[PDB]
Amino acid sequence: PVPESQLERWSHQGATTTAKKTHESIRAALDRYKWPKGKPEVYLQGSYKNSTNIRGDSDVDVVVQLNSVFMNNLTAEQKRRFGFVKSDYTWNDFYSDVERALTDYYGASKVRRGRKTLKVETTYLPADVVVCIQYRKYPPNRKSEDDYIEGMTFYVPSEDRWVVNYPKLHYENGAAKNQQTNEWYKPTIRMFKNARTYLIEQGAPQDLAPSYFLECLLYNVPDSKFGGTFKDTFCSVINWLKRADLSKFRCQNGQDDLFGEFPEQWSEEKARRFLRYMDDLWTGWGQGSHHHHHH
């Protein structure tokens, strides 16, 4: 088994002061720009937002979201029943405005386009900026105009496709689970992240448990498994996952499937591998070895 003090150290959160200032810096840059069709909101997602960061020096995941217009899954008839019209301001237009705002504030040498994000070197931490528009997922047929689930969406020019994410729901649901586990859920995520990274440092696979997939995996574990001590939590969580039917696990945002064939999803086999590595870490700790010819 792993000593409690080791698990407790692994549960520590990295500092967040510099990440928060990075967020405030991006926000201040956008405040200086004149927005032609709505001023976007700026919020954090990712590990810092969700209090699951195990370091204080990782890049900051920032969302720059336009809310004056929305993309959606409505049919033309549903749009008509709601009185909706087309926005003449596009995601492409908005992206160009955000890029100009950031370049004006930080300078061209500090702002560059990535595949899916704008990367910004601030005076605090580097920011990975997702430029997106509000996305409304509406139910079928004729329903109320307030009956929708809110996410966001962005275009990937290199892949001719739209991505829809739900970071606000990811945050909301993780916070709710943390409240209901007497604040053990987020320390437990960090414990497993640090356990994973400890193994990767020793040669375990780089993709043993990508952070987002690991959070989603743990989100599916009953609240009763989190608490008491870190040793009891480590074993109760891993033993429940080993016996669980993973196939219907949902992401923490409540919208997506965790497992599937797309690269946006994990695989059950990768999750089972993570469980095997946690088992081995636990059972191997404190054990003596020798070569088989000395047994």
Residues that constitute the known binding site for ATP:
45-47, 193, 211, 264
What secondary structure does DSSP assign to 103-164, as a single string?
HHHH-GGGEEE-SSSEEEE-SSSEEEEEEEEEEEEPPSSS--TT--EEEEEEEETTTTEEEE
Kindly state the tokens that stand for 14.
């990295």
**What residues form the annotated binding site for Mg(2+)?**
59, 61, 128
Quickly count: other Cβ atoms within 10 Å of residue 173's Cβ.
17
Query: Do the Cβ atoms of 252 and 46 come closer than 8 Å?
Result: no
DSSP string, 188-248: HHHHHHHHHHHHHHTT--TTSS-HHHHHHHHHTS-GGGS-S-HHHHHHHHHHHHHHS-GGG
Please state the φ and ψ torsions of residue 121, each to the nearest 5 degrees.
Answer: -90, 105
- List residues in the chain that are followed by a break over 2.5 Å (C to N): none
Residue 120 neighbours by CB under 8 Å, 6+ apart: 26, 62, 102, 106, 110, 111, 126, 127, 129
194 touches 54 (CB < 8 A): yes
Measured CA to CA in angstroms, residue 190 lies from 25, 51, 144, 266 at distances of 27, 9, 40, 19
Experimental method reported for this structure: X-ray
Cβ atoms of residues 46 and 61 within 8 Å: yes
Q: Nearest Cα to 64, choosing from 45, 41, 47? A: 41
Whether the CB-CB separation of 125 and 59 falls below 8 Å is answered with: yes
In angstroms, the Cα distances linking 4 to 10, 20, 202, 250, 285 are 10, 31, 21, 30, 12
Burial of 150 (0-12, 13-18, 19+ CB in 10 A): middle
Instruction: Indicate the residue type of 165.
Output: N
As annotated, the binding site includes: 45-47, 59, 61, 115-119, 128, 165, 193, 211, 264
Contacts (Cβ under 8 Å, ≥6 apart) of 162: 71, 153, 154, 155, 156
With a CB cutoff of 8 Å and minimum separation 6, the contacts of 3 are 285
Q: State the resolution, in angstroms.
A: 1.6
Binding-site annotation, residues for UTP? 45, 61, 115-119, 165
Distance (Å, whole) CA 63 – CA 98: 11
Which two tokens mark 81? 């029943």
Q: Which two tokens stand for residue 91?
A: 């995601």
- Spell out the domain ranges in the chain: 1-14+46-58+166-295, 15-45+59-165
